[PDB]
């Protein structure tokens, strides 16, 4: 038997003006599409499909979903945000998880290094599509060690 | 058969003066109590109870426990710390996991965005109570996308 | 049946000069060796061995691997990087996961608090050895609440 829990803050639609939530179903950030999915020892797929930057569910159930995104830049603040999204039978793409950083404000800032990891438990249906979207994609580093995206089914 | 490991730094009682450990069983931070636990597609409980801001264990075993807490503020540094605590048959609440950030020190800092994720594996007993506690709770953002708390049993 | 996926950025060998990748099989950072592995309620091993700072695999399969490393210091920027490495039947130690932060650049910075968590899914073989390595080890805090390393097999 599966024994698990995922509970969230009660604010369903946040009124925050800093990183505005979208009200017309528009995706925030730019979807990451340059993922590698079949290098033995580094990446794999087992009964999960990959296409168009999305992991597509074959088996309904509870999944732990996670992503790390590595922001690296050389030189005002940058808003560095990672979104994990779900498409399902619903008119809008759904933000499952959001994680945000601001770069250092000091005028002495020569460069930045901001790895953002997050993950959590979500009930998914067959043919749901999940993907990662980030602000400031031009600052993302697609180093296979530093940026990745995965999920596993919990039995 | 369950195959797993969780090993920790050897310092049992840290002598650090920056974020002092408590010596009289007093909880650090303020417990988060405004969690939502039953919105299909966003939150759920399966053989785990929720009450008084705590996840309460029904089935003894090994759990992966995690929480994300989103600090957002508009304007000295702020100590932003997330504690995951356990109550069991022990005279004190027990810190299982601690994760800390300091806000940017620059006088030019207009705002802050600090999402803190952590998680790990802990052996739990029936009726153990686990909760999340944070410093600077007034800066926490209970956006359901950004702040959450969960666990799952490992078979 | 195990249902899971882990996909990575396509850049196999990153050309970044900021945190240079190693080209002669040399390990980056210093391996953490002062882990505690058998304090009931805080740490444990179940069909995983510990020796020489490494978790050593007894059972081939898919593992979710994670580590948190807590950097704390009192006082230019510091590069704070966590590497999770694998030794297997391969001439070089293999970086599985890298996560990086830079400390605040402000000259007003009195102290720093930088907890770094990361984790992910990797297929491991029997007798593979996995460990954590960090830059600026003298700034690591081996508080058992704040710094840890674990993994579990996914069935
Ligand atoms: Cl920006
Ligand atoms: Cl880049
Ligand atoms: Cl403070
Ligand atoms: Cl707030
Ligand atoms: Cl450095
Ligand atoms: Cl900063
Ligand atoms: Cl230290
Ligand atoms: Zn700063």
Residue numbers in the entry:
A (entry chain D), B (entry chain D), C (entry chain D): 124 to 198, 206 to 285
Give passages from the manuscript.
TRAIL (TNF-related apoptosis-inducing ligand) is a potent inducer of tumor cell apoptosis through TRAIL receptors. TNF superfamily ligands are expressed as type II transmembrane proteins and form homotrimers through their extracellular domains. TRAIL is known to bind five members of the TNF receptor superfamily. TRAIL binds HS with high affinity (KD = 73 nM) and HS induces TRAIL to form higher-order oligomers.
We determined the crystal structure of soluble mTRAIL to better compare to hTRAIL and understand the biophysical characterization of HS and mTRAIL interactions. Though a HS 12mer was present in the crystallization conditions, the oligosaccharide was not visible in the electron density. Similar to hTRAIL, mTRAIL exists as a trimer composed of three β-scaffold core protomers with one protomer comprising the asymmetric unit. A zinc ion, critical for activity, is located on the threefold axis bound by cysteine 240 from each protomer and a chloride ion. A major difference between TRAIL and other TNF family members is an insertion of ~12–16 residues between β-strands A and Aʺ known as the A-Aʺ loop. The N-terminal β-strand A of mTRAIL is found sandwiched between β-stands H and Aʺ of the neighboring protomer’s central β-scaffold core, a pattern repeated for each protomer. Clear electron density can be traced between this strand and β-strand Aʺ confirming the swapping of the N-terminal strand between the protomers. Interestingly, this swap has not been reported in other structures of TRAIL or TNF family members. To explicitly determine the HS-binding site of TRAIL, we performed site-directed mutagenesis of seven conserved lysine and arginine residues on mTRAIL, some of which (Arg119, Arg122, and Lys125) cluster (in triplicate) near the ‘top’ of the trimer and likely form the HS-binding site. Interestingly, these three residues are located at the N-terminus of the soluble TRAIL, which likely adopts a random coil structure because it was not visible in the crystal structure of soluble TRAIL.
